[PDB]
Design a protein around this nucleic acid. Structure first.
Ligand SMILES: NC[C@@H]1O[C@H](O[C@H]2[C@@H](O)[C@H](O[C@@H]3[C@@H](O)[C@H](N)C[C@H](N)[C@H]3O[C@H]3O[C@H](CO)[C@@H](O)[C@H](O)[C@H]3N)O[C@@H]2CO)[C@H](N)[C@@H](O)[C@@H]1O
Ligand SMILES: NC[C@@H]1O[C@H](O[C@H]2[C@@H](O)[C@H](O[C@@H]3[C@@H](O)[C@H](N)C[C@H](N)[C@H]3O[C@H]3O[C@H](CO)[C@@H](O)[C@H](O)[C@H]3N)O[C@@H]2CO)[C@H](N)[C@@H](O)[C@@H]1O
Ligand SMILES: [Mg+2]
Ligand SMILES: [Mg+2]
Ligand SMILES: [Mg+2]
Ligand SMILES: [Mg+2]
Ligand SMILES: [Mg+2]
Ligand SMILES: [Mg+2]
Ligand SMILES: [Mg+2]
Ligand SMILES: [Mg+2]
Ligand SMILES: [Mg+2]
Ligand SMILES: [Mg+2]
Ligand SMILES: [Mg+2]
Ligand SMILES: [Mg+2]
Ligand SMILES: [Mg+2]
Lengths: 129, 144, 97, 52, 50, 203, 212
RNA sequence: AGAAGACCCUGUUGAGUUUGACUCCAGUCUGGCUCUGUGCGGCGA
RNA sequence: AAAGAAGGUGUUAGCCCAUUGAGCCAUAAACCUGAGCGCCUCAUGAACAAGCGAGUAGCACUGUUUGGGAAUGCAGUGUCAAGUGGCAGGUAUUUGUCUGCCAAAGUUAAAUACAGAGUAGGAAGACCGAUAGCGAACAAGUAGCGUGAGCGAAA
RNA sequence: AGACCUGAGUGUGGCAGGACUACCCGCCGAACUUAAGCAUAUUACUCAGCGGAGGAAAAGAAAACAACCGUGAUUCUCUCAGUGAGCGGCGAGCGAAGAGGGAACGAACUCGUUGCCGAAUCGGGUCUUACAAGGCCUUGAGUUGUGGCACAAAUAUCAUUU
């Protein structure tokens, strides 16, 4: 705790490049509480809701609609330009995972967001993160 | 056989052919080829002259398979022709074909008299071997 | 097409006459092709992180001329001379807009 | 064989021959000569080899 | 002479000059270590130190 | 794919953004211990390249080694004999520090079979390596076909014998042809082979 | 007294024999006839273990490299997956029916390719290929008058039922032709030799003469 | 008698010690980059 | 006598004894047998345009290693790639053509070692024969000895 | 309040530690000796020292050799070759590789990446004679990616009942 508090000072005192500055600049509350409430209602179906609809379709020989979640799946939805909006968290612990992520949405002209999350995105979709 | 040795004969002679004055002692002149330019200079110059120095270019990583070129003369081509087939060989008629690279002998040379005219298939040949088998009545056919 | 060999031991085409076959396509033939997705990824990352201390130095005096000094500064720090030419030529494209 | 002792020569200055001798004391072999073709318990001259 | 640089001889003398350098190794740096001046101080009293 | 952006971002190590992240990391790593366990690897693209999966028995440890050459530990710098063997400071160890980091993990955590590691961060004093280990008694690792070979008892300390990737580097097993003829399979396996006086039976 | 002896160079200065202080570095062949016997005993125990398939799998005829050995042939590692397809045969399937397969070998000529296709065409006509189920025969397989008369070979190469390595036939005795009686052979060999031996040495002299 | 002269010499035998012997090595010092960031300037080319 | 075999027995044994064969009997698994053979359960063979391993390779200095020599491999530190390709082609450099292969991740039987190991059991020998051969044919690493490391018999 | 992340404490289920160490793998590393002296060199990348496995280990599936009519993972053997290689106070001395005859050989596969899918995965319970490569159930890990399909021996995706 004495070095997670000095880690926060040191990221503030030093001059930060514009690629990590952009995660300190976050979408506001009215657009974040609107966003995660829309990510909540199109969250993926759970394990019981996916164990059913398949055991109720093995009887038909006897995925409704959701948000794209995951760092391998959301990347494909931009290379294909299928996503209409991407919502990026701001505090992934190796930051290089999504450091490139706003510039991919910018090269392909998908609207993106950097919201104050990774606990609040996983709560919206049923994960921890 | 130990019984055939000089040891068994001079057994009892208490010096074993090494003498009373100067004994048999461990390495009285050095170990090995020590002193080749110093105290064995007369031995190394007289018997082994061209030692001690450098000569020529350095062929780093010599491969002795591409520099393969064995040699046979015209008088030894009877070594490669079967005894059934040399007797039927006459100049101006049907001559036996000798495939040299199947026998060693990458190059034909032209020493001596060729004792049987034949068609030689050789990778290499010389001036005086080509000249001397076309007059004898055969030929030489190049191969790879 | 595969240029038949002349049946004697020396010269051009100096081999055994053997009815040569054409070269057949391998999976390693796909290295000499343009990697248009591997370049698009590298163009996004380069437009993200900025420039090296080498890449800023090579083109801060590629503005004032000094092209053989840019090549000498690359070969000192890249070692190779083909890579020194290419790194200087990659800086001249970033200066071309 | 014949060489598995820690014998050393006593040198010169005692009225004993210059051969390696068994170290230690309190036993009948101690001080006895070792490591030669002529000592007992020592090694044979030119011990035989399997690459003959 | 095995114990100290000044030891030994037939008279008890320091052989070499007994003022050693600042850069002498440990073992060689004995005597008057880096003496700016020696002898009986005739005059004032200079403060000692760097 | 998602890897290609992670892989090309870790090739821009000298750029100003990655020099900021490694600045912060090298600060907070030299205020931790020599051996530190992580939940997730610092470079997940390079950990999974090197063998890590997000399974149950896999586990990653970050190990610190000090930089610089090898001071020969002779007493007081005094050494004896021939003058070629007189040097103390300019001598250098014949193992790289990545191998030394892998051996310090596996000599310390004996119940774990380490597979290879990777470079994480440098300082002026230290280097850090995330060493991937795996628990051989975990029921996931024993039943999984592509990792269950590590449970066999010939892989017990692969790090202490030079069988990891960094081990195979300082043995010279990156080369195969005329550049490794003295050292295949081992220098000792070739020394013994080239020097043993062969006695043919009938000769 | 040394005399007219050769300068020795005997190379025995590196602690090779086991004395009282040295473990040695020495390798003796006293088990040569007992490992000779062991390998044969273990090849007869293996030829029973595999029966009735051949003890050694089929290998192609490949040439030898390095112009010393051009005129020789021997047995290769495996058939390339173009000699196998020219024999109408799947390379993954051929490894199960007794054929060694080599993905690396490149087939740089048609004579060396057709020799090994004929080894595969001979092998499939000698092949019996027992059924999986000896009641329900699935394909062209044995018919149990073949799956009972079947035997194996211990022919040390797998060349019992494909034949030996095919060397070329030596040339028949012929007459000296019209050209070969008067055409100089050394001058044509040396002209071809000197063309490549002085290529560049004379090709720069023209380059030193096309430019002024 | 004692003990392969403790004097002297020989040996291409040592060893303790010394030193502007010969070849080096730690240590001390000194320069370079590094660790090493942020501002306003100044002498420079 | 398909047995001559070589050990024992009061003195030299094919016949005195044990042995020396064909074969009999009994087997926890594992091993081997139309991948032995049924049943249940469970898998599933065959038919009907993108890229491929980055403090990595290389380069510089130093150290070592090598037959590897304008540097074979490695190590430290500085520096640090390319892919609208790179590596090896045994004299350094720039430039071309050619040929081979695709580093920087992982497992893999047998053929090889056992140069002072060990388990279970065989075959022995132009060897030694009680100062020999293992130190030890014996209550031998023992009695003894030394603060200790260790040394170490006789018989 | 709660969450996530980074760290604690206990409970439960496990594992490592020492021995042996002939051979083998990684390091560390001499000197006597030889050069008729001696310092490079040699002894020797050996002894001694430290660490680690196995019944063998290590190597191994081409960023290989070659320069051919080409060869085809590793290992080993004879030979190459005490070398008209090479290294060396070019002294003393040291010292290979390719090719060829063989031994062995059913000898090959698995990730990562890419493309297409996206928890189909893993662990715990429990039920089937069953700590099932079976069902059924679990927020418990896991989407900061487990798994499947295709990638030169390739001719590709899903269906399904034969
Ligand atoms: N007569 C003296 C004895 O010779 C013995 O050795 C003799 C032979 O055993 C030995 O023969 C060796 C042979 O063993 C080894 N396996 C191969 C070698 N080709 C043979 O050497 C042979 O050829 C060389 C020349 O090539 C001749 O000089 C030599 O006389 C001849 N025997 O060479 C020696 C000549 O008689 C022992 N070295 C030794 O007991 C003793 O010196
Ligand atoms: N420092 C280098 C070493 O010098 C040694 O040799 C040196 C010594 O023999 C001798 O050094 C003497 C020193 O003994 C004596 N006690 C003091 C004197 N100042 C030194 O002298 C040396 O050093 C000074 C610089 O400080 C110079 O002025 C002088 O020219 C130089 N001869 O002079 C030689 C030249 O330096 C050894 N050859 C060797 O260890 C090494 O080369
Ligand atoms: Mg000269
Ligand atoms: Mg001894
Ligand atoms: Mg004895
Ligand atoms: Mg070899
Ligand atoms: Mg590097
Ligand atoms: Mg392995
Ligand atoms: Mg008696
Ligand atoms: Mg242990
Ligand atoms: Mg000796
Ligand atoms: Mg001497
Ligand atoms: Mg040792
Ligand atoms: Mg193994
Ligand atoms: Mg995966």
């Amino acid at each position: 705790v004495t070095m997670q508090r000095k880690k926060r000072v040191l990221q503030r005192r030093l001059k930060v490049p514009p690629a990590l500055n952009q995660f300190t600049k976050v979408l506001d509350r009215a657009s974040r509480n609107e966003a995660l409430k829309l990510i909540k209602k199109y969250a993926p179906e759970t394990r019981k809701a996916r164990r059913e609809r398949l055991h109720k379709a093995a009887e038909e020989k006897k995925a409704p609609l959701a948000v794209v979640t995951g760092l391998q799946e959301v990347t494909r939805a931009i290379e294909k330009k299928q996503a209409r909006m991407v919502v990026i968290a701001n505090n992934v612990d190796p930051v290089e995972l999504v450091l490139w992520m706003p510039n991919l949405c910018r090269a392909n002209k998908i609207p993106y967001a950097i919201v104050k999350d990774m606990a609040r995105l996983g709560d919206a979709i049923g994960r921890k993160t | 056989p130990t019984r055939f040795k000089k040891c068994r004969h001079q057994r009892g002679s208490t010096f074993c052919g090494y003498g009373r004055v100067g004994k048999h002692r461990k390495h009285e002149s050095g170990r090995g080829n020590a002193g080749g330019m110093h105290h064995h200079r007369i031995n190394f110059d007289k018997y082994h002259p061209g030692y001690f120095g450098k000569l020529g270019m350095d062929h780093y990583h010599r491969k002795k398979n591409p520099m393969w070129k064995p040699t046979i003369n015209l008088n030894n081509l009877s070594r490669l022709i079967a005894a059934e087939e040399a007797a039927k060989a006459t100049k101006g008629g049907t001559l036996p074909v000798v495939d040299l690279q199947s026998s060693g002998y990458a190059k034909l040379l032209g020493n001596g008299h060729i004792q049987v005219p034949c068609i030689v298939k050789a990778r290499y040949v010389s001036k005086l071997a080509d000249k001397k088998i076309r007059k004898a009545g055969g030929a030489v056919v190049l191969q790879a | 097409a595969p240029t038949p060999r002349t049946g004697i031991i020396a010269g051009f085409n100096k081999g055994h006459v053997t009815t040569r076959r054409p070269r057949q396509p391998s999976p390693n033939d796909r290295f000499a092709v343009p990697h248009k997705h591997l370049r698009a990824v590298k163009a996004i990352i380069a437009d993200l992180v900025g420039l090296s201390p080498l890449e800023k130095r090579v083109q801060e005096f590629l503005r004032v001329g000094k092209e053989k000094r840019a090549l000498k500064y690359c070969k000192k720090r890249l070692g190779d001379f083909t890579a020194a030419k290419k790194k200087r030529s990659k800086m001249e494209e970033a200066l071309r807009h | 064989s014949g060489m598995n002792h820690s014998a050393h020569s006593w040198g010169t200055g005692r009225a004993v021959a210059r051969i390696p001798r068994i170290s230690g004391g309190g036993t009948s072999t101690s001080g006895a000569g070792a490591f030669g073709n002529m000592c007992r318990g020592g090694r044979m001259f030119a011990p035989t080899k399997i690459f003959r | 002479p095995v114990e100290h640089p000044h030891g030994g001889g037939n008279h008890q003398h320091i052989g070499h000059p007994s003022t050693v350098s600042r850069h002498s190794p440990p073992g060689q740096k004995v005597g008057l270590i880096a003496a700016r001046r020696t002898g009986r101080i005739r005059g004032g009293k200079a403060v000692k130190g760097a | 794919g998602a890897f290609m952006y992670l892989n090309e971002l870790w090739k821009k190590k000298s750029s100003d953004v990655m020099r900021f992240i490694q600045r912060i990391r090298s600060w907070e790593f030299r205020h931790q211990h020599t051996v530190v366990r992580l939940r997730r690897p610092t470079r997940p693209e390079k950990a999974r390249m090197l063998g890590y999966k997000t399974k149950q028995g896999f586990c990653v440890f970050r190990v610190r080694v000090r930089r610089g050459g090898r001071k020969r530990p002779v007493h007081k710098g005094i050494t004896y004999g021939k003058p070629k063997t007189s040097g103390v400071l300019g001598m250098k160890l014949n193992k790289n520090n990545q191998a030394v980091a892998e051996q310090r993990l596996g000599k310390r955590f004996g119940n774990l079979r380490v597979l290879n590691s990777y470079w994480v961060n440098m300082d002026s004093t230290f280097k850090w390596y995330e060493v991937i280990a795996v628990d051989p008694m975990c029921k996931t690792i024993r039943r999984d076909p592509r990792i269950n070979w590590i449970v066999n008892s010939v892989h017990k300390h692969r790090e202490q014998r030079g069988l990891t990737s960094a081990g195979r580097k300082h043995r010279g097993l990156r080369h195969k042809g005329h550049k490794a003829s003295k050292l295949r399979p081992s220098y000792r396996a070739a020394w013994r082979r080239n020097n043993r006086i062969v006695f043919l039976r009938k000769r | 007294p040394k005399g007219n002896n050769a300068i020795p160079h005997v190379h025995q200065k590196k602690h090779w024999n086991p004395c009282s202080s040295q473990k040695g570095n020495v390798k003796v062949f006293l088990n040569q006839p007992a490992q000779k016997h062991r390998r044969r005993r273990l090849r007869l125990l293996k030829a029973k273990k595999v029966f009735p398939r051949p003890l050694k799998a089929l290998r192609p005829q490949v040439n030898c490299p390095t112009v010393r050995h051009n005129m020789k042939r021997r047995l290769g590692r495996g058939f390339s997956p173009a000699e196998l397809k020219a024999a109408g045969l799947n390379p993954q399937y051929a490894a199960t029916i007794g054929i060694r397969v080599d993905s690396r070998r490149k087939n740089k000529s048609e004579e060396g390719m057709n020799v090994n296709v004929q080894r595969l065409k001979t092998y499939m006509s000698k092949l019996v290929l027992f059924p999986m189920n000896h009641k329900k025969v699935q394909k062209g397989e044995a018919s149990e008058e073949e799956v009972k008369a079947a035997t194996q070979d211990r022919s040390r190469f797998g060349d019992a039922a494909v034949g030996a390595v095919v060397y070329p036939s030596a040339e028949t005795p012929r007459a000296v032709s019209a050209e070969e009686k008067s055409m100089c052979v050394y001058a044509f060999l040396k002209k071809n030799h000197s063309a490549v031996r002085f290529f560049g040495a004379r090709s720069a002299r023209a380059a030193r003469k096309e430019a002024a």
